Symmetry: C3
Subunit: 332 residues, 3 copies
């Protein structure tokens, strides 16, 4: 009887940050209530000033990470205000039945809907918009995110001992296919609707024009770099709703990786680089051991350094010469 | 002494269906006899009426699934009738030596051959044609299939308890590279031989024009949708002889997945999406929990919804509101 | 105190061969000293005589495999002689901190540097050049290799029993992006520097013009085929610094595979084909059971047979008819 369960309202935060939650569950099953507002907006995605009409959950690319526990109920109020132009919906890969909720969540501009589902399987899972006949266009315009369903006793290593993270970040990787004129310049449109047939032709090439973390080239750099301290345990959740990726932390490793993101399986250990298939979210746990700048990249290095799939960590603390040292500095 | 073993003749069925077999072996080792006839035929692969000269085992794309048990002998009579034009052969990834049988099975039009091999390793494995110097052309013209070698005591979960499927389906995914004129229209040829150099140029782009299940856009939809009932245990075998794929059941999961298809390994649990590398067959076990339409897609959604890698399941039975429900239907 | 540890000087050998080493460690931790000299050179990569300006460690593509044990220190003297033109460095994915050593190893032509790091994690790992702002150009010009960090007690199977290899080979797979004129002919340059902007444009296509083992189309064939004897245990280390690959031994299997190359994890068994993600090294163990020619391919067969990702093994010994036999040779 769901009416006797506690309800809790969560306010979502912008990626790469994640709303507050408990790793080990301090209550029994709950109905966890979320609200999301669809926003169609103009987004500038690179240094050149290239602009797309992005389709977003809650104003961001990716949409926010939702965090619940196994056997919680998720109740999502989804709002499509009348300032938008398109029909949208939501498919949760975490959910069972009705096209992951897609069949029950079709909202025209001006409409809302509330969907509930039980989170029966632990792991990180993609969610994405998927309207009949326009599925890839919505997804590759930025309309995807992820949900983490933690086991009620938190994460476990390959032996079954607890793993506790001190910080968690969410990296949404987005493949864009900006249409081009005959000469290779990116085209501009006044509405999302105008671009439809050119977007289809751009997608059919299977060649993205940009691949970005958190919605833009350089989004996770400078003042927006991810931060940590030597000795901190960091969980990085990474999703790609449409195309394969191969994350790598330059200067580090994935100590424990769930590459396909499902926590009933034991993690892979000591990974240099791991494959997250398109349509999947994965999770990597790392304990930082050296201070400095680290780059976190898709290790197709063309995709990383030319197309934009690179961000930075800035890590504070003490340098350990036993792990690494320059014996003779560069010289004649 | 193979002469003292029982022989059994199996008649193959068209995909996505699979010939009858026992999961747990009810006899000792056998010589299981199969026959396949190579057919070159004109195939229409999309709604636009685009036609290719397909090269098939037994008239279908994919070729039929063969099912044996570990330590059976497979004996394959392969017939290339004189109405064909090309030399063909067969490489079984399940087999050991002679290029998977490829070196011993070269048949000109008018010839047959009989190959025997011992199925020493359990799993689902690709088979494909592979004639010297024309390997990708044959494979990407549809000349591939799969064989399942069951452990003699059937399938096991990650703990080692039996897993029993009520139904089994075989999904062959095929990347095609239809050559195009200067303007982007698909070219037409009277024979397979005519297309050779244009096919090579189309392949070298690494960009397929179509990606289909069971030989055509929409082949596993409408009246040809896969069927099941709530509470049935379904095994889906999926192969791709040439290009990576990432299957996903929309509205469901892969409860137990052997992504690289080899049953001595424990399955991966609770998968949303899994990667089957090109040149591999994989297997996913699911128990249906909700009725309705499910889409089974390659979750590069461009490949799925624009290039054709999508099919449907229609599932009958009772709807479970505890797993999912619409709390407030779409409205103002 | 590193000053009390034994030092040992190793001389590197050209791939596909590997310097001598012990599987099970016969000493305690050591500082293992290597030297590498960067060479920029003109390389012919195909039968047509297409030439690139390759950037190499020690004159080869890939660079040589370095082999140490877990908790050894690696000390690398890296020399950029003044006959080169570019700035280079080295990132070891095996190492912790400073961008895998990249931040500390920047050497102009005329300079050297010596870097030390502790090999804390067992597995096969990529190393590659990664100079600020020119990372993919260096990597895709051939400037990558691998290091194997063996557990001190050698390799173990999934149950934990020893696995001992009789031979080891290293296959570096290289994606090249040779720039093309308007008509599709490959362009030629007098220096590496001249090509820079055309190379960037070629890379941005995400479509390699060639994919090769050991630096050229046909490099591991004929007189340069890999050799083995029936009953030998062979370890094949395989790396790809930039793009996903899916190795397959035609006529054989991967009996034990570490697809993502990290030995604290149990191997995958009985693989037909496995995915090594770009930015990763993997390892496959096989025991040969039949004599003859075997092809070792990337099983995107276009990439293999049209773009060049294929080599051969020649295996000597006795033919086993129980595993495979031609019952009726090709005939009318
Ligand atoms: O500006 N709205 O796409
Ligand atoms: O689905 N593209 O990796
Ligand atoms: O091909 N996907 O990175
Ligand atoms: O789904 N594997 O963590
Ligand atoms: O290049 N050594 O000074
Ligand atoms: O019609 N035969 O390709
Ligand atoms: O081999 N192409 O994924
Ligand atoms: O790139 N293979 O879907
Ligand atoms: O090969 N793994 O099931
Ligand atoms: O958009 N709410 O009616
Ligand atoms: O010839 N040196 O690139
Ligand atoms: O990163 N390309 O498979
Ligand atoms: O797409 N990498 O073979
Ligand atoms: O990293 N897996 O062997
Ligand atoms: O094609 N049989 O002789
Ligand atoms: Cu939408
Ligand atoms: Cu989806
Ligand atoms: Cu053929
Ligand atoms: Cu094959
Ligand atoms: Cu370099
Ligand atoms: Cu790297």
């Amino acid at each position: 009887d769901i009416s006797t369960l506690p309800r809790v309202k969560v306010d979502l935060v912008k990626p790469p940050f994640v709303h507050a939650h408990d790793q080990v569950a301090k209550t029994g099953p709950r109905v966890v209530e979320f609200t999301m507002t669809i926003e169609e907006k103009k987004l500038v995605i690179d240094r050149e000033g290239t602009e797309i009409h992005a389709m977003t959950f809650n104003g961001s690319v990716p949409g926010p990470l939702m965090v619940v526990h196994e056997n919680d109920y998720v109740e999502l109020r989804l709002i499509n205000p009348d300032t938008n132009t398109l029909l949208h919906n939501i498919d949760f890969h975490a959910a069972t039945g009705a096209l992951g909720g897609g069949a029950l969540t079709q909202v025209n501009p001006g409409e809302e809907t509330t969907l509930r589902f039980k989170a029966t399987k632990p792991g990180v899972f993609v969610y994405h918009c998927a309207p009949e006949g326009m599925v890839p266009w919505h997804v590759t315009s930025g309309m995807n995110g992820a949900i983490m369903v933690l086991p009620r006793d938190g994460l476990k290593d390959e032996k079954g001992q607890p793993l506790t993270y001190d910080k968690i970040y969410y990296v949404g990787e987005q493949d864009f296919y900006v249409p081009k004129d005959e000469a290779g310049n990116y085209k501009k449109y006044e509405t999302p609707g105008e671009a439809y047939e050119d977007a289809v032709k751009a997608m059919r090439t299977l060649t993205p024009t940009h691949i970005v973390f958190n919605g833009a080239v350089g989004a996770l750099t400078g003042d927006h770099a991810l931060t940590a301290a030597v000795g901190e345990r960091v969980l990085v959740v990474h999703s790609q709703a449409n195309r394969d990726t191969r994350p790598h932390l330059i200067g580090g490793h994935g100590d424990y990786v769930w590459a396909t993101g499902k926590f009933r399986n034991p993690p892979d250990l000591d990974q240099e680089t791991w494959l997250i298939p398109g349509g999947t979210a994965g999770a990597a746990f790392y304990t930082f051991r050296q201070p400095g700048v680290y780059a976190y990249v898709n290790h197709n290095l063309i995709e990383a350094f030319e197309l934009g799939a690179a961000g930075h960590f800035k890590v504070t603390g003490e340098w350990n010469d036993d792990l690494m040292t320059s014996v003779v500095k560069p010289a004649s």
